Design a protein around this motif. Structure first.
Motif, PDB file in Angstrom:
ATOM      1  N   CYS A 103       0.788  -1.225   0.000  1.00  0.00           N
ATOM      2  CA  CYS A 103       0.000   0.000   0.000  1.00  0.00           C
ATOM      3  C   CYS A 103       0.831   1.291   0.000  1.00  0.00           C
ATOM      4  O   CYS A 103       0.378   2.279  -0.572  1.00  0.00           O
ATOM      5  N   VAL A 104       2.012   1.347   0.630  1.00  0.00           N
ATOM      6  CA  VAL A 104       2.863   2.551   0.591  1.00  0.00           C
ATOM      7  C   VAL A 104       3.844   2.478  -0.568  1.00  0.00           C
ATOM      8  O   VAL A 104       3.836   3.367  -1.411  1.00  0.00           O
ATOM      9  N   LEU A 105       4.639   1.411  -0.692  1.00  0.00           N
ATOM     10  CA  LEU A 105       5.587   1.254  -1.803  1.00  0.00           C
ATOM     11  C   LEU A 105       4.913   0.845  -3.131  1.00  0.00           C
ATOM     12  O   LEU A 105       5.606   0.553  -4.101  1.00  0.00           O
ATOM     13  N   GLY A 106       3.581   0.840  -3.206  1.00  0.00           N
ATOM     14  CA  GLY A 106       2.809   0.381  -4.359  1.00  0.00           C
ATOM     15  C   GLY A 106       1.388   0.945  -4.440  1.00  0.00           C
ATOM     16  O   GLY A 106       1.106   2.034  -3.941  1.00  0.00           O
ATOM     17  N   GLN A 107       0.509   0.199  -5.103  1.00  0.00           N
ATOM     18  CA  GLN A 107      -0.932   0.430  -5.237  1.00  0.00           C
ATOM     19  C   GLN A 107      -1.576  -0.932  -5.462  1.00  0.00           C
ATOM     20  O   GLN A 107      -1.275  -1.578  -6.470  1.00  0.00           O
ATOM     21  N   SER A 108      -2.421  -1.409  -4.549  1.00  0.00           N
ATOM     22  CA  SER A 108      -2.854  -2.800  -4.587  1.00  0.00           C
ATOM     23  C   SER A 108      -4.234  -2.956  -5.193  1.00  0.00           C
ATOM     24  O   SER A 108      -5.187  -2.319  -4.758  1.00  0.00           O
ATOM     25  N   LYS A 109      -4.366  -3.857  -6.171  1.00  0.00           N
ATOM     26  CA  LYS A 109      -5.662  -4.261  -6.748  1.00  0.00           C
ATOM     27  C   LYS A 109      -6.403  -5.319  -5.918  1.00  0.00           C
ATOM     28  O   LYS A 109      -7.381  -5.908  -6.373  1.00  0.00           O
ATOM     29  N   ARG A 110      -5.975  -5.538  -4.676  1.00  0.00           N
ATOM     30  CA  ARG A 110      -6.722  -6.254  -3.636  1.00  0.00           C
ATOM     31  C   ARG A 110      -7.824  -5.353  -3.076  1.00  0.00           C
ATOM     32  O   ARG A 110      -7.614  -4.163  -2.834  1.00  0.00           O
ATOM     33  N   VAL A 111      -9.002  -5.919  -2.852  1.00  0.00           N
ATOM     34  CA  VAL A 111     -10.105  -5.227  -2.175  1.00  0.00           C
ATOM     35  C   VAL A 111      -9.803  -5.126  -0.687  1.00  0.00           C
ATOM     36  O   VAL A 111      -9.205  -6.035  -0.127  1.00  0.00           O
ATOM     37  N   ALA A 113       3.477   5.765  15.100  1.00  0.00           N
ATOM     38  CA  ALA A 113       2.818   5.817  16.403  1.00  0.00           C
ATOM     39  C   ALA A 113       3.678   5.054  17.416  1.00  0.00           C
ATOM     40  O   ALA A 113       4.406   4.143  17.012  1.00  0.00           O
ATOM     41  N   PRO A 114       3.636   5.368  18.720  1.00  0.00           N
ATOM     42  CA  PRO A 114       4.361   4.581  19.714  1.00  0.00           C
ATOM     43  C   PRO A 114       3.986   3.089  19.631  1.00  0.00           C
ATOM     44  O   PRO A 114       2.814   2.726  19.741  1.00  0.00           O
ATOM     45  N   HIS A 115       4.980   2.232  19.385  1.00  0.00           N
ATOM     46  CA  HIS A 115       4.836   0.779  19.178  1.00  0.00           C
ATOM     47  C   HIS A 115       3.949   0.339  18.007  1.00  0.00           C
ATOM     48  O   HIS A 115       3.566  -0.828  17.922  1.00  0.00           O
ATOM     49  N   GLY A 116       3.628   1.228  17.075  1.00  0.00           N
ATOM     50  CA  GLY A 116       2.681   0.960  16.002  1.00  0.00           C
ATOM     51  C   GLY A 116       2.988   1.718  14.723  1.00  0.00           C
ATOM     52  O   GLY A 116       3.852   2.589  14.674  1.00  0.00           O
ATOM     53  N   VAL A 117       2.221   1.420  13.686  1.00  0.00           N
ATOM     54  CA  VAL A 117       2.144   2.246  12.480  1.00  0.00           C
ATOM     55  C   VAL A 117       0.692   2.580  12.209  1.00  0.00           C
ATOM     56  O   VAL A 117      -0.201   1.779  12.486  1.00  0.00           O
ATOM     57  N   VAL A 118       0.468   3.777  11.687  1.00  0.00           N
ATOM     58  CA  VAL A 118      -0.797   4.198  11.099  1.00  0.00           C
ATOM     59  C   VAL A 118      -0.616   4.342   9.597  1.00  0.00           C
ATOM     60  O   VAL A 118       0.242   5.098   9.148  1.00  0.00           O
ATOM     61  N   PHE A 119      -1.447   3.679   8.810  1.00  0.00           N
ATOM     62  CA  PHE A 119      -1.542   3.956   7.388  1.00  0.00           C
ATOM     63  C   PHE A 119      -2.732   4.862   7.144  1.00  0.00           C
ATOM     64  O   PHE A 119      -3.875   4.489   7.398  1.00  0.00           O
ATOM     65  N   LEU A 120      -2.463   6.060   6.635  1.00  0.00           N
ATOM     66  CA  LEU A 120      -3.476   6.882   6.004  1.00  0.00           C
ATOM     67  C   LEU A 120      -3.642   6.372   4.580  1.00  0.00           C
ATOM     68  O   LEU A 120      -2.848   6.707   3.703  1.00  0.00           O
ATOM     69  N   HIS A 121      -4.625   5.501   4.367  1.00  0.00           N
ATOM     70  CA  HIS A 121      -4.966   4.987   3.047  1.00  0.00           C
ATOM     71  C   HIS A 121      -5.855   5.972   2.296  1.00  0.00           C
ATOM     72  O   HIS A 121      -6.826   6.472   2.858  1.00  0.00           O
ATOM     73  N   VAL A 122      -5.517   6.256   1.039  1.00  0.00           N
ATOM     74  CA  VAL A 122      -6.160   7.252   0.179  1.00  0.00           C
ATOM     75  C   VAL A 122      -6.863   6.512  -0.938  1.00  0.00           C
ATOM     76  O   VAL A 122      -6.221   5.819  -1.724  1.00  0.00           O
ATOM     77  N   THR A 123      -8.185   6.606  -1.022  1.00  0.00           N
ATOM     78  CA  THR A 123      -8.986   5.714  -1.876  1.00  0.00           C
ATOM     79  C   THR A 123     -10.045   6.437  -2.703  1.00  0.00           C
ATOM     80  O   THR A 123     -10.713   7.353  -2.231  1.00  0.00           O
ATOM     81  N   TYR A 124     -10.202   6.029  -3.964  1.00  0.00           N
ATOM     82  CA  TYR A 124     -11.276   6.489  -4.837  1.00  0.00           C
ATOM     83  C   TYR A 124     -12.561   5.746  -4.478  1.00  0.00           C
ATOM     84  O   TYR A 124     -12.635   4.521  -4.613  1.00  0.00           O
ATOM     85  N   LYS A 139     -10.894   1.038   2.710  1.00  0.00           N
ATOM     86  CA  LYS A 139     -12.136   0.795   1.950  1.00  0.00           C
ATOM     87  C   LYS A 139     -12.193   1.675   0.701  1.00  0.00           C
ATOM     88  O   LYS A 139     -11.794   2.841   0.734  1.00  0.00           O
ATOM     89  N   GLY A 140     -12.729   1.136  -0.385  1.00  0.00           N
ATOM     90  CA  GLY A 140     -12.780   1.808  -1.680  1.00  0.00           C
ATOM     91  C   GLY A 140     -11.953   1.089  -2.730  1.00  0.00           C
ATOM     92  O   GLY A 140     -11.664  -0.099  -2.598  1.00  0.00           O
ATOM     93  N   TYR A 141     -11.537   1.832  -3.748  1.00  0.00           N
ATOM     94  CA  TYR A 141     -10.467   1.437  -4.652  1.00  0.00           C
ATOM     95  C   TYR A 141      -9.206   2.195  -4.259  1.00  0.00           C
ATOM     96  O   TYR A 141      -9.254   3.402  -4.039  1.00  0.00           O
ATOM     97  N   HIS A 142      -8.092   1.491  -4.098  1.00  0.00           N
ATOM     98  CA  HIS A 142      -6.854   2.064  -3.583  1.00  0.00           C
ATOM     99  C   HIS A 142      -6.179   2.997  -4.576  1.00  0.00           C
ATOM    100  O   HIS A 142      -5.955   2.612  -5.718  1.00  0.00           O
ATOM    101  N   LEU A 143      -5.798   4.192  -4.136  1.00  0.00           N
ATOM    102  CA  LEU A 143      -4.940   5.072  -4.916  1.00  0.00           C
ATOM    103  C   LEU A 143      -3.505   5.027  -4.414  1.00  0.00           C
ATOM    104  O   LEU A 143      -2.612   4.692  -5.184  1.00  0.00           O
ATOM    105  N   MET A 144      -3.284   5.374  -3.150  1.00  0.00           N
ATOM    106  CA  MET A 144      -1.970   5.416  -2.502  1.00  0.00           C
ATOM    107  C   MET A 144      -2.128   5.443  -0.979  1.00  0.00           C
ATOM    108  O   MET A 144      -3.235   5.610  -0.477  1.00  0.00           O
ATOM    109  N   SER A 145      -1.050   5.290  -0.218  1.00  0.00           N
ATOM    110  CA  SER A 145      -1.101   5.384   1.248  1.00  0.00           C
ATOM    111  C   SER A 145       0.123   6.061   1.845  1.00  0.00           C
ATOM    112  O   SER A 145       1.176   6.116   1.214  1.00  0.00           O
TER     113      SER A 145
END
Ligand SMILES: *[C@@H]1O[C@H](CO)[C@@H](O[C@@H]2O[C@H](CO)[C@@H](O[C@H]3O[C@H](CO)[C@@H](O)[C@H](O)[C@@H]3O)[C@H](O)[C@H]2NC(C)=O)[C@H](O)[C@H]1NC(C)=O
Ligand SMILES: *[C@@H]1O[C@H](CO)[C@@H](O[C@@H]2O[C@H](CO)[C@@H](O[C@H]3O[C@H](CO)[C@@H](O)[C@H](O)[C@@H]3O)[C@H](O)[C@H]2NC(C)=O)[C@H](O)[C@H]1NC(C)=O
Ligand SMILES: *[C@@H]1O[C@H](CO)[C@@H](O[C@@H]2O[C@H](CO)[C@@H](O[C@H]3O[C@H](CO)[C@@H](O)[C@H](O)[C@@H]3O)[C@H](O)[C@H]2NC(C)=O)[C@H](O)[C@H]1NC(C)=O
Ligand SMILES: *[C@@H]1O[C@H](CO[C@@H]2O[C@@H](C)[C@@H](O)[C@@H](O)[C@@H]2O)[C@@H](O[C@@H]2O[C@H](CO)[C@@H](O)[C@H](O)[C@H]2NC(C)=O)[C@H](O)[C@H]1NC(C)=O
Ligand SMILES: *[C@@H]1O[C@H](CO)[C@@H](O[C@@H]2O[C@H](CO)[C@@H](O)[C@H](O)[C@H]2NC(C)=O)[C@H](O)[C@H]1NC(C)=O
Ligand SMILES: CC(=O)N[C@@H]1[C@@H](O)[C@H](O)[C@@H](CO)O[C@H]1O
Ligand SMILES: *[C@@H]1O[C@H](CO)[C@@H](O)[C@H](O)[C@H]1NC(C)=O
Ligand SMILES: *[C@@H]1O[C@H](CO)[C@@H](O)[C@H](O)[C@H]1NC(C)=O
Ligand SMILES: *[C@@H]1O[C@H](CO)[C@@H](O)[C@H](O)[C@H]1NC(C)=O
Lengths: 240, 314, 40, 47
Positions: free
Chosen positions: A110-118, A134-145, A123-129
C-alpha cells in the motif's frame, strides 16, 4: 480532487485531535503489558503456604532446616508464576509478530505500491497510502477512490449495426433514453460509439439481449469530403 | 472462524463448596483473576473473529423476488423461506453434518446467533449477484448479472464476447457445478471435517479438564467432601493443598492449550476475512487463492463455527 | 430521564436493490477518501 | 500518432498542457492518395 484530499486529511487530523479510542489497538497492547507485569508483581505477595511472602522474613526468623520448607514454597510459587507469565507473553509476542508482518505487508503493498486487492489498503479502490509513526505501532493513512453520486441507466451487452456484433474494448454501453454511448466502467464520461471504442465478433443470433444502433465510422465522412471535392474536379474537367 | 466459547471458574473447579479450600486457593494470589481474564480474552475474541469475517458490508442487501439472472440458478445458495431459519439448501446441510453444567465448566453463547450470521451471508451474496463488486469499494450499483460475469472474463484475460457467445453453456455448466457440490455434500462427511476437527479438540480438552478433577496427586481422595467428612480442619490441608496444586496445574495447562489454539483459530479467521475481502467482495488474480483455476467470483456460506466459500473458476 | 435499554441488535441499514437484466447504475461523481488504519 | 493517444475536451482545464503535432497517420496517407488522384486528373488533361 485536491480539495477532497485536503478536506479528508484535515478531517483525519480533526478526528485524531478529538476522538479517544482510534489508537485503541495500540493502547490495548500497552494495557496488556502493564496488566501482565502488574500481575507478575502481585504474585510476589502470595504466601504459597510459607510462613510469610517476604523472603527476608524467612531468613530473619528461621534457620536452614525449617527455612527450607518455607523458601521452597516461595520458589515454587514464583517459578510457576514466571513459567505462566513468559508463556502468556510468548503467545502475545506472536500476536505482535502477526500484527507486524501484516503491517510490513501493508507498508510494502500500500505505501511502496498500489494494490488491486479489495479492502487491503482501506475501503474503496486504492490510490496510494502514507505511513505515520505511532508509539509501538504504524498508522496507514490509506487514500482511496470511492464512487459518490450515481444514477440508473439502461444498458445492453452488444450493439448490432451490420448484423455483426460490436462490444466495448473497455467500458460498457449506456442509454440515457434517446441515444447509445460507451462509458468507462467507474465514472460517467459517455462517448459516441466507434470502431475505436468497440471490437467485433460473430453475429446477432447468439448474444442474448442484443440491441440495435449504428456504430460511427470516422473514415467514411472524411473520405466522403474528398469525394465531394473529387465531384467538383470531375465537373470542372467537363468544361475543357 | 470461531471455536466454541468456554468459561471455567477456579472457585468452582478447585473448590466444590469448601471455604477451607477457598482460603487455601487465595493463598496463591492473582492466578484466578488472571485465569478468568485469559478465558474472557478468548470469549471476547470468538465474537471478534465472527465480526471480521461477516461484517465486511455496512448495509443488508435483499435479493429481488424474480430470478432475472440470465441462466444462473443461485436458489440453492440464496435463502429458502420454507425453513424456520432464513438459510439456504446448502447452509441447512452445513448444520446437519457438524443452562449450566456441574463443576463450573460453562459454554457461553456467541454474540451473533447463527441466524444473524446467515443473514450477513445472504446480504454479502445478494450484493455479489446484483451489485458487481461495487458494494465493497463504495455504494451498491446494480449491473445485469451476466454483464458482471462479462467483467469477470475480461478480468481473467478472456474477451467478453466469449461469454455472450456461450452464456447458455456457461450457465448449464454453472447450474451443474452448484448441483455437483450438493451431491458431494449430501453423502460425504470429510468435505466439512475441518470444522469437526476443531470441535473435537475443544471437546477433547474439556474431557481432559473434567477428567483431571478425578486425580489424587498423593491426596487420600480425588474428592473434596470425602476428605472434609473424615479428616478435621488442620491435618486435612496436607490433602487439600495437593488437590489444589494438582488442579491448578490442570487449569494452567488447559488454558495454555486454549490460548494456543485461539491463536490458530485467529490465524484461520483472519485468513477467512482476507478470503471474504478478495474472493467475495472482488475478483482476485492471486493464483489458486480463491480455489484452483482462474477465479471468477465466490459465494460465502454459513456453517457451525466457520465460513465456507463456494469459489467459481474458469 | 435516562435509562439502560436492551434489544436484538440490527445488522445496520436495510437495502432492497433495484436489479434488472437491462439496468446499470454508474457513478457521475466520486470522493477521494482518507481513512486511518492502525496496527501494533 | 492518434493511435498512441486518446482525446477529451479542450486546453482550458488541463494544468500545464503543452502545444505540439499529434500527426494522424491516416492523413499523410490520404494526402498521398489525393496526389495520386491529382496525377490521374493531370493524365486525364492529356487525351
Ligand atoms: C441523451 O444524451 C444526448 C447527448 O447529450 C442528448 O441529446 C443532445 O441534446 C442537446 C441539447 O441539450 C443537443 O444539442 C443541440 O441542440 C440544438 C438542436 O437544434 C442546437 O441549437 C444546439 O446548438 C445543439 O447542436 C444535441 O444535438 C443532442 N445530441 C445528440 C447526439 O443528438 C439527449 O437529450 C439525452 N437524452 C436523454 C433522454 O437524456
Ligand atoms: C434489430 O435490427 C434488425 C434489422 O433492423 C431487425 O431485423 C429485421 O426484423 C424484421 C421484422 O421481423 C424483418 O422483416 C421481415 O420479416 C419476414 C422475415 O422474417 C419477411 O417475410 C418480411 O417481408 C420482412 O422482410 C427483417 O428481415 C429483419 N432484418 C434483418 C436484416 O435482420 C431486428 O428484428 C431488430 N431487433 C430488435 C429487438 O430491435
Ligand atoms: C498553444 O497554441 C495556441 C494557439 O493554437 C496559443 O494560443 C494563441 O496565443 C496567441 C498569442 O498569445 C493569441 O494571439 C492573440 O492574443 C490576443 C487575444 O488572446 C490578441 O489581443 C492578440 O492581438 C493576438 O492576436 C491567440 O489568440 C491564441 N489563440 C488561442 C486559440 O488561444 C497558446 O498560447 C499556445 N500555448 C502554449 C503554452 O504554447
Ligand atoms: C433506479 O430505479 C428504481 C426503480 O425504477 C424506476 O421506477 C420509476 C419510479 C421511474 O423512475 C422509472 O423510470 C425507473 O425505472 C428506483 O427505485 C425506487 O427507489 C425509491 C427510493 O429512492 C424507493 O422508494 C422505491 O421503492 C424504489 N422502487 C423500486 C421498484 O425499486 C431507484 O431509486 C433508481 N435509482 C437511481 C440511482 O437512479
Ligand atoms: C434451480 O435448481 C433447483 C434444483 O434442481 C430446481 O428445483 C427443482 O425444480 C423442479 C421444477 O420446479 C421440481 O420438479 C424439482 O422437484 C426441484 N428439485 C429440488 C431439489 O428442489 C429449481 O426449479 C431451479 N430454479 C430455477 C429458478 O430455475
Ligand atoms: C502520358 C502519360 O502520362 N501517360 C501515363 C502512363 O505512362 C501511365 O502508365 C498511366 C498509369 O496511370 O498513366 C498515364
Ligand atoms: C428482462 O426481463 C424481462 C422480464 O422480467 C423481459 O421482458 C426482458 O425481455 C428481459 N430482457 C433480457 C435481455 O433478458
Ligand atoms: C477548375 O480548373 C481551373 C483550371 O483549369 C481552376 O482555375 C479552378 O480553380 C478549378 N475550379 C474548381 C471548382 O475545380
Ligand atoms: C511549475 O513550477 C514553476 C516554478 O518552479 C512555476 O513557475 C510553473 O508555473 C509551474 N507549472 C505548472 C504547470 O504549474
Amino acid at each position: 480532487i485536491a480539495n477532497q484530499f485536503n478536506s479528508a486529511i484535515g478531517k483525519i487530523q480533526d478526528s485524531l485531535s478529538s476522538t479517544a479510542s482510534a489508537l485503541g489497538k495500540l493502547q490495548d497492547v500497552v494495557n496488556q503489558n502493564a496488566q501482565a507485569l502488574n500481575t507478575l508483581v502481585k504474585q510476589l505477595s502470595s504466601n504459597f503456604g510459607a510462613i510469610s511472602s517476604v523472603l527476608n522474613d524467612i531468613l530473619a526468623r528461621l534457620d536452614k532446616v525449617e527455612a527450607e520448607v518455607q523458601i521452597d514454597r516461595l520458589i515454587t510459587g514464583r517459578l510457576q508464576s514466571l513459567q505462566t507469565y513468559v508463556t502468556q507473553q510468548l503467545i502475545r509476542a506472536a500476536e505482535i509478530r502477526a500484527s507486524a508482518n501484516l503491517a510490513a505487508t501493508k507498508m510494502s503493498e500500500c505505501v511502496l505500491g498500489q494494490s488491486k486487492r479489495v479492502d487491503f489498503c482501506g475501503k474503496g479502490y486504492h490510490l496510494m497510502s502514507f505511513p505515520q509513526s505511532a508509539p509501538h505501532g504504524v498508522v496507514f493513512l490509506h487514500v482511496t477512490y470511492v464512487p459518490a453520486q450515481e444514477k440508473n441507466f439502461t444498458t445492453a451487452p452488444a450493439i448490432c449495426h451490420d448484423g455483426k456484433a460490436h462490444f466495448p474494448r473497455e467500458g460498457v454501453f449506456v442509454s440515457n433514453g434517446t441515444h447509445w454511448f460507451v462509458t468507462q466502467r467507474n465514472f460517467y464520461e459517455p462517448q459516441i460509439i466507434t470502431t475505436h471504442n468497440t471490437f467485433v465478433s460473430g453475429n446477432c443470433d447468439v448474444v442474448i439481449g442484443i440491441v440495435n444502433n449504428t456504430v460511427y465510422d470516422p473514415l467514411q465522412p472524411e473520405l466522403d469530403s474528398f469525394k465531394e471535392e473529387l465531384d467538383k474536379y470531375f465537373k470542372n474537367h467537363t468544361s475543357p | 472462524v470461531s471455536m466454541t466459547k468456554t468459561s471455567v471458574d477456579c472457585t468452582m473447579y478447585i473448590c466444590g463448596d469448601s471455604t477451607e479450600c477457598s482460603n487455601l486457593l487465595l493463598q496463591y494470589g492473582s492466578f484466578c483473576t488472571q485465569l478468568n481474564r485469559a478465558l474472557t480474552g478468548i470469549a471476547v475474541e470468538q465474537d471478534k473473529n465472527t465480526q471480521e469475517v461477516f461484517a465486511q458490508v455496512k448495509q443488508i442487501y435483499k435479493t429481488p423476488p424474480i430470478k432475472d439472472f440470465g441462466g444462473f440458478n443461485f436458489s440453492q445458495i440464496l435463502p429458502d423461506p420454507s425453513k424456520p431459519s432464513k438459510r439456504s439448501f446448502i447452509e441447512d446441510l452445513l448444520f446437519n453434518k457438524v443452562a449450566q453444567k456441574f463443576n463450573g465448566l460453562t459454554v457461553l453463547p456467541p454474540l451473533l446467533t447463527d441466524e444473524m450470521i446467515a443473514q450477513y451471508t445472504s446480504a454479502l451474496l445478494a450484493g455479489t449477484i446484483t451489485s458487481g463488486w461495487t458494494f465493497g469499494a463504495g455504494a451498491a450499483l446494480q449491473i445485469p448479472f451476466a454483464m458482471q460475469m462479462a467483467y469477470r472474463f475480461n478480468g481473467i484475460g478472456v474477451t467478453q464476447n466469449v461469454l455472450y457467445e456461450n452464456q447458455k453453456l456457461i450457465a448449464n455448466q454453472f447450474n451443474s457445478a452448484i448441483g455437483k457440490i450438493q451431491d458431494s455434500l449430501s453423502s460425504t462427511a470429510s468435505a466439512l471435517g475441518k470444522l469437526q476437527d476443531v470441535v473435537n479438540q475443544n471437546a477433547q480438552a474439556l474431557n481432559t479438564l473434567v477428567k483431571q478433577l478425578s486425580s489424587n496427586f498423593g491426596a487420600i481422595s480425588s474428592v473434596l467432601n470425602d476428605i472434609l467428612a473424615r479428616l478435621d480442619k488442620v491435618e486435612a490441608e496436607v490433602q487439600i493443598d495437593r488437590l489444589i496444586t494438582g488442579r491448578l496445574q490442570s487449569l494452567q495447562t488447559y488454558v495454555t492449550q486454549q490460548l494456543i489454539r485461539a491463536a490458530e483459530i485467529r490465524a484461520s479467521a483472519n485468513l477467512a476475512a482476507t478470503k471474504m475481502s478478495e474472493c467475495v467482495l472482488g475478483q482476485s488474480k492471486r493464483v489458486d487463492f480463491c480455489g484452483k483455476g482462474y477465479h471468477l467470483m465466490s459465494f460465502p456460506q454459513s456453517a457451525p463455527h466457520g465460513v465456507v466459500f463456494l469459489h467459481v473458476t474458469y | 430521564s435516562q435509562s439502560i435499554i436492551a434489544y436484538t441488535m440490527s445488522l445496520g441499514a436495510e437495502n432492497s436493490v433495484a436489479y434488472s437484466n437491462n439496468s446499470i447504475a454508474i457513478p457521475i461523481n466520486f470522493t477521494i477518501s482518507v481513512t486511518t488504519e492502525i496496527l501494533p
